[PDB]
Symmetry: D2
Subunit: 198 residues, 4 copies
C-alpha cells in the first residue's frame, strides 16, 4: 500500500535537552510528511506514464522517486534509532561486532563523528552492513540517496541536514553531533544487526 | 575477508553476437578488477586512519569506499544476470510480480529501457525490491552509487557506462539496450526475487 | 593574494523584517568565513602537493577547492545583491533584457521562484548570462558548485541552504523566497549585467 | 540565436596518431551534435513553461538546460584547444603565468594529469582563471556541469568521458591523457588567457 508517516514511540519533547521538542515536531510533522507525500506522488506519476505509454519525463520521475523514497526510508530509521531511555554503549553481539570492525567503540565513534561533520551540503552519517563482503561499514551519504552501494542494510543513521539542528545549535554542528550519542537507541541498532546477519 | 573478482559462469565470447567477447574480457579482467582493488584499498585506508586516529581525509575515504564498493557490487550482479541460455521472458512468481507492479512485461521493459537510455553520464538501469513498502521498483542509478534508497535489494541491472558497449555499438546505446534482452538470465532474477521477498 | 571575507555595505539588522539580523550575523560571520578559510586551505594544500610531487589526494583537494571557492564566490555576490534601499523592479536595459528573455518581469519571477523552492537538498536559484549563446538564463545550482556551465557570469543569486532562513521562517521556504524580492539590489544586478554584456 | 554545431578547423584525421579520425568523427558528428540539440530543446521547453505558466517540471528543465549547455560549451572549447600543428610548450605571458601559478610547466602537467585520470565516472580536467582571486587554477569537473565555481573562464580542457578514447586506447586512459600533450593548441590557450585577464 501507500507510504505512511510513522508514529513516534515518544513525545516530541522526550529527547530534551539533547534534541529540542520544537525540532522534533517540525522535523516529524513537516519535513518527514513531505517526503512521504513525495514518494506517494512519484509512484503515482510512474503508474500514469506506464498507462499513457509516455516516458519523456523518466529522468524527473526516477529522481523524485529516489529522493523522496530515500528521505522516507532515512527518517523512518532515524525515529527508531532514537530514545529517551537511550545512550550509554552497545552490549553483546553488536558491541563485539563493532570493536572487531572498528578497533573499539571509541574508534567507531570518532569515524562516525568525522563522517557526520564533514558533509559538504545536506547529508547523513550511516552505519550499515555489507552483505557482499559481510562487513560493518560507515558511509557518508549526500542528501538522502547518494554515496553508498546497493543492498547495504542501514543500522544507525545521524541526520546532518541543517533542519535537524539549526534552531537549537545554529551553526555548531559538532555540538549536535556530540549530543546525539546521548539519545541513541542501541536496542534498535542491535535488532537491525541481528536481522542483517540472519 | 577481502573483496575478490568473481569467475564468470561462461566463456568471454558466449554472449555473441549481442555482447562481444572483446568487451566481456576488458570489462571483466580490467574494469571490474579495478573496482575490486579500489574497494580493498579503501577498507585498508580506513583501518589506517582509525589506527593513527586521523580522519582528515574522511571525505575522500568514504567516497573511495562507496564508489569502488558499488562498482564491485554492481558488476558482480551483472555477470550473474547474464547468460548464453538466456532471453525469453520471466515465468512464475516473478512474471506475475512484474505484471502486477508494471502493468505487463512489455510495460516493464519500456520503462527499464527509458531509464537505461536517458542517463546523463555513466549509470545503470536497475530493477530493485523496496523492503519498506514491499514493492518492485525501477531505479536510474548515476555512476555506481547515486540515486536510489538504502536497503533496496537489486534484482536485474543493465550497465550503461560507455565501456559496456562502445567498442561494439559505438554511440548507438539503444541498440545495445535492446540486445540485452536476449541475454538476461531470468533464473537468476527469479532467485534474487525469492530471497528478497523471503 | 588570499581570499578574504568581504565587509557588508549595511548593518546586520538592516534587512528586517525580511531577513533577520540574527541570520545575517551567523551567515556572514560564521558560514561565509568558513568557506573563505576552506578556500585558502585548499589552495595551500595544492601548493604542497605540487612541492612534494604527490597527488594521491587530488580528488579530495580538487573537491575542497571547488566547494569552498564556490561557497565563497556565491556568498560574496549574495551580500551585494542585497540592500535596505532595495526592492521594486529593475529599470532600463536590464528591465528590457529580462522581459525579452523571460516574457515579462513577473514571468521571470515565477521561474526563479520555482527554481529556488524545488531544490532537493542545499542549493541556490541563479540568474546568469551565457557568453556562448548571448542569453540570460536561470540555473538551479545544487550545493554551491553543481548544475551549471563553465563561463556563465552570475547576476542575481538566492541562497536556498537551510541556514539562510531556518531560524526565521523554519520550514516555510516559500515565504522566505517571497520576502527576498523586497531586498534585492537591482543597482547591483544592473551593474553586473552591463559588465557581462561588455 | 540557436546553439549551433561548430565546424572543425582541421580534417577528422589530422590528429593521428594521437587521436584517431574515427573518434573525432563520432565525437563531433554524433556526440557534440546531440548536446547542441539538447540545449536547443531545453531553451524551447523553458519558453513553453513560461507561456503556459506551469513550472511543474522546473527541476527536469533546469537539469536538461545545464547538462546539454555544458556539454556544448565544453566540446566547443575542446575543438579549439586541439591542433595538428600543436604540442610543445606554452610561450610568453602564459608560460610565465603557468610557472608562477604551478611552480613549473611540468608541475602543472602532473597536476592536470592526475585530475584527468582520477575522475570516478565521466568528467574532464580543466585549466581555468578565477576572476575573484585573480588566479589560474585546475578543476576536476564531473560529467559536464559539476564541481567548479560560477564565473570561472575555461582556458584548456581535456575530455575524459570514455567515448573520447575508448575505441583507440580502450581502458588505458593514461596513455590517452599522455598523448593529448602532443596536440594542444597553445595559441588558443594563450588567446583565452589574454581575454580572461583583460
Ligand atoms: Fe531530516
Ligand atoms: Fe561496467
Ligand atoms: Fe548561505
Ligand atoms: Fe566528449
Amino acid at each position: 500500500a501507500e507510504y505512511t508517516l510513522p508514529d513516534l514511540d515518544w513525545d516530541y519533547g522526550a529527547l530534551e535537552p539533547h534534541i529540542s521538542g520544537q525540532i522534533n515536531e517540525l522535523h516529524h510533522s513537516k519535513h518527514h510528511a513531505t517526503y512521504v507525500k513525495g514518494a506517494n506522488d512519484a509512484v503515482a506519476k510512474l503508474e500514469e506514464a506506464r498507462a499513457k505509454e509516455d516516458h519523456s519525463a523518466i529522468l524527473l520521475n526516477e529522481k523524485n522517486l529516489a529522493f523522496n523514497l530515500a528521505g522516507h526510508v532515512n527518517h523512518t530509521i532515524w525515529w527508531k534509532n532514537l530514545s529517551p531511555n537511550g545512550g550509554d554503549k552497545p552490549t553483546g553481539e553488536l558491541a563485539a561486532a563493532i570493536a572487531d570492525a572498528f578497533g573499539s567503540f571509541d574508534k567507531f565513534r570518532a569515524q562516525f563523528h568525522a563522517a557526520a561533520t564533514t558533509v559538504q551540503g545536506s547529508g547523513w552519517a550511516a552505519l550499515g552492513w555489507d552483505t557482499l563482503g559481510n562487513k560493518l561499514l560507515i558511509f557518508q551519504v549526500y542528501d538522502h540517496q547518494t554515496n553508498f552501494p546497493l543492498a547495504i542494510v542501514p543500522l544507525l543513521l545521524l541526520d546532518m541536514w541543517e533542519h535537524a539542528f539549526y534552531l537549537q545549535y545554529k551553526n555548531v554542528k559538532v555540538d549536535f553531533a556530540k549530543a546525539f550519542w546521548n539519545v541513541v537507541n542501541w536496542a534498535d541498532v542491535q535488532s537491525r544487526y541481528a536481522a542483517a546477519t540472519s
